[PDB]
Design a protein around this ligand. Sequence first.
Ligand SMILES: Nc1nc2c(ncn2[C@@H]2O[C@H](COP(=O)(O)OP(=O)(O)NP(=O)(O)O)[C@@H](O)[C@H]2O)c(=O)[nH]1
Ligand SMILES: [Mg+2]
Length: 166
Amino acid sequence: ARILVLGLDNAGKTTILKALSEEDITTITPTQGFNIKSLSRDGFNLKIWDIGGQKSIRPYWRNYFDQTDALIYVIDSADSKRLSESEFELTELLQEEKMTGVPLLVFANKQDLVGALAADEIASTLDLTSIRDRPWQIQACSAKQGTGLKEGMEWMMKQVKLEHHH
Ligand SMILES: Nc1nc2c(ncn2[C@@H]2O[C@H](COP(=O)(O)OP(=O)(O)NP(=O)(O)O)[C@@H](O)[C@H]2O)c(=O)[nH]1
Ligand SMILES: [Mg+2]
């Protein structure tokens, strides 16, 4: 499955990917273009695209909308000065024709920091309960500390799997 990871600059996209890859986050720098990582877990082959979020390169996001199987949107839960910007960019994404029906996982990141907003507050600001056109989930997490990441990825896998029924 092809996974696309978006969100504002500094939200923690690359740190989450390296945490999933069991590698060192000490040496992470802002992403000028994008990163690709292949990950095999629980009988699944994930190809993950992590795109840089600085506004200057944000128009490039649309290059990667084709053949997307799931969207992960990352937000810095402790940076309330940037919430309006994060909601504007997500609402634009959800109006894209190429992303019709694609499952949405929101990672409410940096829960380890003082003043981090709870998942329910973030859900309210992003107006997630008004979505009608796709499956969605919000998950609180800390990439520095590893919590929440497994739970999020398990929800996402359930949505993209070929499911067998009786
Ligand atoms: N306290 C804390 N800091 C975090 C957490 N996740 C990431 N950070 C920090 O936040 C900063 C930005 O992380 P980074 O992964 O580069 O963000 P990004 O979303 O990839 N930015 P860009 O899109 O510009 O590449 C880094 O200093 C990183 O260590 C977290 O869960 N807790
Ligand atoms: Mg990055």
